[PDB]
């Protein structure tokens, strides 16, 4: 986030998700999984809207719907059941929060509230 801000000031351009994604994966790969960061990286930039996941060993993947963590299987069950192409904003919030709820109820590692 710090290096992306300096890059944005240097280039006089709004930062890109692929930049944050590339910088994260090269850092995590360097530390061979010893930095246990499992991230879902999303954002809008001049290129458009992007959704990525990045695992601790520095592997990235692209999707329309992703889930990570202990409740990923509970969440992915809901996403695999209710996801379609061309979702509206209201539908995507509903699907996202429902997938978290699946994790909250059915996973002991997940609980409390839903942040969006």
């Amino acid at each position: 986030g710090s290096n992306i801000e300096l890059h944005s000031l240097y280039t006089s351009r709004e930062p890109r998700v692929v930049s944050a994604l590339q910088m994260l994966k090269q850092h995590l790969f360097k530390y061979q999984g010893h930095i246990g960061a499992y991230l879902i990286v999303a954002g809008v930039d001049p290129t458009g809207s992007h959704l990525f996941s990045i695992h601790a060993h520095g592997s990235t993947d692209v999707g329309y719907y992703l889930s990570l963590g202990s409740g990923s299987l509970a969440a992915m069950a809901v996403l695999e059941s209710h996801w379609k192409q061309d979702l509206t904003k209201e539908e995507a919030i509903k699907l996202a929060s429902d997938a978290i709820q699946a994790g909250i109820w059915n996973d002991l590692g997940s609980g409390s509230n839903v942040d969006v």
Binding site: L68, G69, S70, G71, G109, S110
Partner: peptide, 5 residues
């Protein structure tokens, strides 16, 4: 310990 979703 550490804090660990």
């Amino acid at each position: 310990x550490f804090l660990f979703x």
